[PDB]
Amino acid sequence: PNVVFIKTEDPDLPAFYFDPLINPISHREPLPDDDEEFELPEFVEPFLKD
Amino acid sequence: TPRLMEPYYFVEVQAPADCVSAVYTVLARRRGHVTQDAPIPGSPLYTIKAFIPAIDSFGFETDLRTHTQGQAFSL
Amino acid sequence: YLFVFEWDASEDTSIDYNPLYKERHQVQLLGRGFIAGIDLKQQKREQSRFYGDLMEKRRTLEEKEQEEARLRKLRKKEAKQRWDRHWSQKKLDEMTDRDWRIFREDYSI
Amino acid sequence: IRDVPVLYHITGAISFVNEIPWVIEPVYISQWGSMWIMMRREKRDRFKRMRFPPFDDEEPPLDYADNILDVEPLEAIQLELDPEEDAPVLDWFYDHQPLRDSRKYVNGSTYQRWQFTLPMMSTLYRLANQLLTDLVDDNYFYLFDLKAFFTSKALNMAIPGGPK
Numbered sequence: 001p002n003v004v005f006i007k008t009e010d011p012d013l014p015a016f017y018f019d020p021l022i023n024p025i026s027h028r029e030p031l032p033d034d035d036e037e038f039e040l041p042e043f044v045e046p047f048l049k050d
Numbered sequence: 051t052p053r054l055m056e057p058y059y060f061v062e063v064q065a066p067a068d069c070v071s072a073v074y075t076v077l078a079r080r081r082g083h084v085t086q087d088a089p090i091p092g093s094p095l096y097t098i099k100a101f102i103p104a105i106d107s108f109g110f111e112t113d114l115r116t117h118t119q120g121q122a123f124s125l
Numbered sequence: 126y127l128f129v130f131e132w133d134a135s136e137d138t139s140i141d142y143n144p145l146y147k148e149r150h151q152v153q154l155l156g157r158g159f160i161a162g163i164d165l166k167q168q169k170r171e172q173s174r175f176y177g178d179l180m181e182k183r184r185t186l187e188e189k190e191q192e193e194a195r196l197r198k199l200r201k202k203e204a205k206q207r208w209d210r211h212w213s214q215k216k217l218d219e220m221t222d223r224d225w226r227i228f229r230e231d232y233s234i
Numbered sequence: 235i236r237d238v239p240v241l242y243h244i245t246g247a248i249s250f251v252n253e254i255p256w257v258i259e260p261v262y263i264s265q266w267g268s269m270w271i272m273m274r275r276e277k278r279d280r281f282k283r284m285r286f287p288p289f290d291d292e293e294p295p296l297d298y299a300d301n302i303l304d305v306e307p308l309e310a311i312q313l314e315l316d317p318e319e320d321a322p323v324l325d326w327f328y329d330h331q332p333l334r335d336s337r338k339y340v341n342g343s344t345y346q347r348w349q350f351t352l353p354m355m356s357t358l359y360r361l362a363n364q365l366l367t368d369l370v371d372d373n374y375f376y377l378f379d380l381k382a383f384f385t386s387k388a389l390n391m392a393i394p395g396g397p398k
């Protein structure tokens with residue numbers, strides 16, 4: 001399969017960046033209502049946010 | 051007035067941004083025509099959708115993968 | 126359907142009269158990959174000059190200035206590097222000992 | 235200079251070297267790539283080839299104790315090695331056996347196994363860019379690899395560009 005690795009030429013750019021050799025994605029589901037309020041406990045965090 | 055009929059294959063070619071013109075060059079001699087050329091969203095590759103005579107499709111994949119340095123692939 | 130230290134030209138292969146195989150259409154690899162050893166400026170001169178148009182079409186309007194600033198930094202590094210000229214365009218007070226040794230080598234003394 | 239062990243006979247009949255030239259492979263490739271860059275630099279800047287066999291047929295070979303022993307040699311071939319980018323590789327790039335007395339990187343004095351850190355590998359991959367191709371996959375070498383060459387051997391044909 002075609003390795004689609006694209007080389008980085010500028011060190012001042014961020015490591016994860018939308019390099020515009022990649023073609024642009026064209027833009028445009030059972031979403032529940034906000035009234036059935038689900039609440040997380042306060043110590044719940046996303047992983048590795050620090 | 052009886053006539054004959056031959057089978058036509060559908061061809062999709064996955065190629066980089068410059069080899070597409072080489073694909074147009076290769077398909078020019080096997081009595082084919084390119085119907086669709088579409089960029090893949092979220093990827094730097096293109097898709098070429100075409101028809102070819104099946105009697106002309108002998109060695110077609112080897113022609114593409116030799117003329118395009120093995121980069122383009124076709125089914 | 127039906128002794129010789131050189132190599133002879135009759136031992137050669139790839140003598141094929143095909144329009145597909147003489148012009149084999151080598152890759153340039155997204156304008157980023159380079160063939161090793163062959164000079165990088167000469168490879169940038171002999172390119173198809175097609176992906177540069179795709180860059181200057183699809184870069185952001187600030188990214189043309191970013192590309193120009195990166196090229197100015199690269200030219201600054203090249204000017205710091207060259208500050209290795211030939212002795213015909215240099216002066217006497219700036220002519221280092223390596224340059225005098227190459228000047229002695231030029232006239233076979 | 236290079237200092238090697240020597241096995242020798244009691245009367246000087248024969249003299250041996252008794253050392254295997256072990257090197258670390260990416261360091262070795264990076265060092266020869268730096269040589270390639272410096273010699274391209276030297277031919278684009280500067281040639282007089284040396285005159286072969288220098289010592290004539292009637293004179294003996296030179297005595298080491300009187301002519302080479304106290305003469306300091308000339309400057310070798312070394313790249314500049316910019317201290318900002320080449321900082322993890324600066325203290326060991328042109329040694330005889332690099333990082334030999336370091337317990338972090340080389341297993342010991344026999345110089346057999348090595349392990350490196352990732353910015354060091356980044357630097358050694360950056361300096362060796364002239365000797366390495368830009369290939370990323372095996373979609374290259376299509377009908378130009380060992381199995382296709384063995385097939386052309388068994389079928390007695392010639393690949394365009396391939397051997398006969």
